[PDB]
Design a protein around this ligand. Structure first.
Ligand code: ATP
Ligand code: CA
Ligand code: CA
Ligand code: CA
Ligand code: CA
Ligand code: CA
Length: 903
DNA sequence: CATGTTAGCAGTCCGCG
DNA sequence: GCGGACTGCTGAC
């Protein structure tokens, strides 16, 4: 097979590389790497090396990496550019792997681990590691085994061995319900003392050295804890054995009362699943406990236990170990679904970077662009210093707050990357400038055509048309992969709806799920078979379709994020290709594009509807338009439609056959106006929205910019079995809004859009009556707790203290002195509840770590002093008031003359 | 070491015969 | 009691 790297490090003048050889064996090597950098040279001097502007450079081959570094310093002192890749391990990767890397994940050792540490005196701080490690579960992807290290003897208690037989039993049977599919994969190893456990853990680690190291919170807890605990017992050089090159770096950061640390293990690529999840999932969660996330992702229940975790090992060591094991398996299950390890590997090898560098779009793009330019013997510019400067972004139309009955939406496919490609925006394609007219002069086609030679943006920039830019070139490759995966995702989505439709009429049969590829639209044969399937087979097929859709989602949305990240990086001062002329060329072109196409759509729709000056576009943001379709529907008359699906079909056809071709002509004109390289403004129909035919539903409403709700029947070609709400910006979409309040507000919206005012009033009345019976967690607000200390004046709120921070301080005073009360961690999330006047906490609110029950010592007092009136008014009524006033609707029946009668 | 800008709502502080 | 300037937080692109 073709060789590929696993890890790469620079240590002094050596490159340390772990890799997979031609026979598929893991190998390591130390290389005294001889880097090159480049300096500009006279034109007369023959060379094969040119900078991106075509100026000749001479190559400086260095005896070692330190020499290269020292040379950069001297060049800086002289005042001349030192060109070429200054991150030498990227250079090394590019030289060693001068071909498209084809990697084999089955040869890559991925390790998933977690540790337990009993602590009777508060959270066990990794930097101090003063408590024994009493469990480790380490899953190895190559062995497909869960290696369990179990401490039987501890200063905090001597316990018996863990029983695998009891672990497999149902909980209702006294067991731990360790999933049966991993029972046979567990290798269990008990130890009579911690030193033996840790020693054997290190020997194991040496035999099975992780390449990718993952797990839940491993970077902030497990890794530094293991490292510091081993250091305290055996010495630092023993602790350094966690690195295959025996090198680590300690990063102390650093709460300021007290502190913590991150450990770099050289020759390992740490990808903490919590970090993967936050970057790649596109959720914002109220809490990031593994229990919370597992439940959200997998619909498994909380791993319940009686008493505090500080006492679980002594009282129920059996459950303690099982739960250690399950927590490790849960990360694997989340990854089986989400496939973030797969994505990280794809992206990392595609760029030729250290795998952990996928967290950095700038490092990722630097490597991609360097490799691309290198292949053509071109030489990359030196990184330069730049002050941070603000610059303009997108246009967002101010909508008239209102109900909007029938709506059709359109937006640009991959807007900013498409703008980059259309205009040919790259550092090396800049041709010059032109004198700018006011933006609205371009929007209304009155300004002079900028150029008849070059491709233009209304920011004043001109670009060559007849040559490729590396930025356009490389952004296109990633865009094309994105498009492939999104296609797979949407096919799976459409496939899912076919299955949901068939679930209305399941067959009474024992049969099998159909063996199909969900990435492709079902054929007629498959659809016929589906209509004969049982509920069992259908539901299983639906699970598989949704898993296929999630996988396509992960793959497409993050490649979308990466290409959009390139457009953003042009405006980040650390990017090698930072240039506000290029960043603003994109954003300004976007502003024109949106407002240009608004004009064109209003013009077209007036023409075809036989009218003039009516506003059809009611809203737009960056690259989208929202078109009121009321007049389209009224032109033919609602009477003519059989059911909802008929008018949906009608608008679908109208958008595709009439509007889109009008839009396309509109944008082709704009392309010629800017004399662009290639027409790439593709504005496809997004949503078709309206109330059910013959209902009192209002269809949609806007309260303002970035705030709206739509009852959607068709979304990018997916015709739903059941209407789906598209809600943006409203409190239902915010992780700070209480769970049950999100739910109730969403049902309030569903009822408004689908059913009418009366239905809304019915639900409101009921929710108001029952509010006080909801679980306290379900009705608590959520916030991030940043800069707690800044507002901590003797345990009391200082000036300008935010509400949620006040709550934390109230909590800190209530718990002061209690050894095992969970501390609020700086920067993490808290639940927040308001308190009534005269409460024993001495303040108007309390807050505590989110995803958790509030400590039992104060729980009852919280429950008793909870201010429901404030909670209902703030979280539920006030947002609902905003929705309903905008929609011109009442959530309570207003008083009127009819109140004089007895109905 | 290192994607971007635009934007609304909740809260504090302050003024206000 | 309620606005306006302000910080903080949270999303929509
Ligand atoms: N996370 C982000 N970082 C930087 N720029 C962004 C981001 N999200 C959106 N934008 C900018 O807004 C534009 C429009 O956003 P949108 O969500 O419509 O994505 P898109 O790139 O057009 O992809 P799609 O084809 O899915 O619409 C992007 O092309 C860019
Ligand atoms: Ca644990
Ligand atoms: Ca778009
Ligand atoms: Ca059937
Ligand atoms: Ca959009
Ligand atoms: Ca689309």
């Amino acid at each position: 097979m073709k060789e590929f790297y696993l890890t790469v490090e620079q240590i002094g003048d050596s490159i340390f590389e772990r890799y997979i050889d031609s026979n598929g064996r893991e190998r390591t090597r130390e290389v005294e790497y001889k880097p090159s950098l480049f300096a500009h040279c006279p034109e007369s001097q023959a060379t094969k090396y040119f900078d991106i502007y075509g100026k000749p450079c001479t190559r400086k081959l260095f005896a070692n990496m330190r020499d290269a570094s020292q040379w950069i310093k001297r060049m800086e002192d002289i005042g001349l550019e030192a060109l070429g890749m200054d991150d030498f391990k990227l250079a090394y990767l590019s030289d060693t792997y001068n071909y498209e890397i084809k990697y084999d994940h089955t040869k890559i050792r991925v390790a998933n681990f977690d540790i337990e540490v009993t602590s009777p005196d508060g959270f066990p701080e990794p930097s101090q590691a003063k408590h024994p490690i009493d469990a480790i579960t380490h899953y190895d992807s190559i062995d497909d085994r869960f290696y369990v290290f179990d401490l039987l003897n501890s200063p905090y208690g001597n316990v018996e061995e863990w029983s695998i037989e009891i672990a497999a039993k149902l909980q209702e049977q006294g067991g731990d319900e360790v999933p049966s599919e991993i029972i046979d994969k567990i290798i269990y190893m008990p130890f009579d003392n911690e030193k033996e456990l840790l020693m054997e853990y290190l020997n194991f680690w040496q035999q099975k050295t992780p390449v990718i190291l993952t797990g839940w919170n491993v970077e902030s807890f497990a890794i530094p804890y293991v490292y510091n605990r081993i250091k305290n017992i055996f010495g630092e050089s023993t602790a350094k054995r966690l690195s295959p090159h025996r090198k680590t770096r300690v990063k102390v950061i650093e709460n300021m009362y007290g502190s913590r640390e991150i450990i770099t293990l050289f020759g390992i690529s740490v990808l903490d699943y919590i970090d993967l999840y936050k970057k790649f999932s596109f959720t914002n969660q109220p809490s990031y406990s593994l229990d919370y996330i597992s439940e959200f992702e997998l619909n498994v229940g909380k791993l319940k236990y009686d008493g505090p975790i500080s006492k679980l090992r002594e009282s129920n060591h059996q459950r303690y170990i099982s739960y250690n094991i399950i927590a490790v398996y849960r990360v694997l299950q989340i990854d089986a679904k989400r496939q973030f390890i797969n994505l990280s590997l794809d992206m990392g090898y595609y760029a030729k970077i250290q795998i952990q560098s996928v967290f950095s779009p700038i490092k990722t793009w630097d490597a991609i662009i360097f490799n691309s330019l290198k292949e053509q013997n071109k030489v990359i510019p030196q990184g330069r210093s730049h002050p941070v400067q603000p610059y303009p972004g997108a246009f967002v139309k101010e909508p008239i707050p209102n109900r909007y009955k029938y709506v059709m939406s359109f937006d640009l496919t991959s807007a900013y990357p498409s703008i980059i490609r259309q205009v040919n925006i790259s550092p090396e394609t800049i041709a010059g400038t032109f004198k700018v007219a006011p933006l609205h002069d371009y929007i209304n086609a009155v300004a002079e055509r900028p150029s008849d030679v070059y491709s233009c943006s209304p920011n004043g920039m001109m670009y060559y048309k007849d040559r490729d830019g590396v930025v356009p070139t490389e952004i296109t490759k990633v865009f094309n992969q994105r498009k492939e995966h999104k296609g797979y995702m949407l096919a799976a989505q459409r496939n899912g709806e076919i299955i949901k439709e068939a679930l209305h009429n399941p067959n009474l049969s024992v049969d099998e799920p159909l063996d199909v590829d969900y990435r492709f639209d079902f054929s007629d044969e498959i659809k016929e078979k589906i209509k004969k399937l049982s509920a069992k087979s259908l539901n299983e097929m639906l699970f598989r379709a949704q898993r296929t859709e999630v996988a396509g989602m992960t793959a497409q949305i993050n490649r979308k994020a990466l290409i959009n990240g390139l457009a953003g990086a042009l405006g980040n001062v650390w990017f090698r290709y930072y240039d506000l002329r290029n960043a603003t060329a994109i954003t300004t072109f976007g502003q024109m594009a949106l407002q240009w196409i608004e004009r064109k759509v209003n013009e077209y729709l007036n023409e075809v509807c036989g009218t003039e000056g009516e506003a059809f576009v009611l809203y737009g943001d960056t690259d989208s338009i929202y078109v009121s379709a009321d007049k389209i529907i009224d032109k033919v008359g609602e009477s003519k439609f059989r059911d909802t699906n008929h008018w949906v079909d009608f608008l679908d056809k109208f958008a595709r056959e009439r509007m889109e071709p009008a839009i396309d002509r509109g944008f082709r004109e704009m392309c010629e106006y800017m004399n662009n390289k290639q027409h790439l403004m593709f504005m496809d129909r997004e949503a078709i929205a309206g109330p059910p035919l013959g209902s009192k539903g209002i269809g949609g409403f806007w309260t303002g910019k970035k705030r709206y709700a739509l009852n959607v029947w068709d979304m990018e070609g997916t015709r739903y079995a059941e209407p789906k709400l598209k809600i943006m910006g409203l409190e239902t979409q915010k992780s700070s809004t209480p769970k049950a309040v999100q739910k109730a507000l969403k049902e309030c919206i569903r009822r408004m859009l689908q059913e009418g005012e009366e239905s809304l009033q019915e639900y409101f009345k009921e929710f108001e009556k029952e509010f006080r019976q909801l679980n306290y967690i379900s009705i608590a607000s959520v916030s991030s707790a940043n800069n707690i200390a800044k507002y901590d004046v003797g345990g009391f709120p200082g000036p300008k203290c935010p509400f949620h921070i006040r709550g934390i301080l109230t909590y800190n005073r209530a718990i002061k002195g209690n050894i095992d009360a969970p501390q609020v961690v700086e920067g993490e999330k808290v639940y927040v509840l308001p308190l009534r006047e005269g409460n024993p906490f001495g303040d108007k609110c309390i807050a505590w770590p989110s995803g958790t029950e509030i400590t039992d010592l104060i729980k009852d007092d919280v429950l008793h002093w909870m201010d429901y009136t404030v909670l209902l008014e703030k979280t539920f009524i006030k947002p609902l008031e905003g929705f309903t006033s905008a929609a011109k609707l009442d959530y309570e029946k207003k008083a009127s003359l009819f109140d004089m009668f007895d109905f």
